[PDB]
Design a protein around this ligand. Structure first.
Ligand SMILES: COc1ccncc1CC(=O)N1CCC[C@H](CCO)C1
Ligand SMILES: [Zn+2]
Length: 139
């Protein structure tokens, strides 16, 4: 689990969005596994505006933050799960690292701020949904 809190926005994995989130929907993209909902209080996370390919992510299944190199956001085939059929996930970044389903929501960060959140995994690879292109999160 986990979310990004920036301004009056809450960014979560779409497959983990609650009743409050869909009701207060700002934007969602199934192909990206992202959902943004409005919030009453102001958030304090800064979104990174960069092309960094190295950062640190939180892995709840290990209670540890791991440094990783990750690929640039792209269209990656993701195996079927209980949340989605087999499909190409867009704006996805992969790294060699540990992840489990309950690790979704874990933040990936570089020196510039929040890069994205854990979204997929399997076979010693962890996939992160990029949020750096969502410029409107800043306004
Ligand atoms: C972090 O997720 C891990 C990690 C390791 N084994 C499994 C998983 C779960 C996983 O990959 N998926 C289930 C939840 C939605 C995912 C698609 C999102 O577009 C697919
Ligand atoms: Zn950066």
């Amino acid at each position: 689990s986990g979310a990004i809190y920036v301004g009056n926005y809450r960014v979560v994995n779409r497959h983990l969005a609650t009743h409050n989130d869909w009701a207060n929907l700002v934007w969602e993209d199934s192909s990206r596994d992202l959902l943004v909902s409005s919030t009453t209080a102001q958030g304090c996370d800064t979104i990174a505006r960069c092309d960094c390919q190295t950062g640190v992510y939180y892995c709840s299944s290990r209670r540890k933050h791991y440094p990783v190199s990750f690929s640039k956001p792209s269209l990656i085939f993701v195996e079927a799960s209980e949340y989605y059929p087999a499909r190409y996930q867009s704006h996805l970044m992969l790294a060699v690292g540990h992840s489990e389903p309950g690790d979704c929501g874990g933040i990936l960060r570089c020196q510039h701020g929040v890069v994205g959140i854990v979204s997929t995994g399997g076979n010693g690879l962890v996939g992160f949904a990029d949020v750096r292109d969502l410029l409107w999160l800043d306004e």
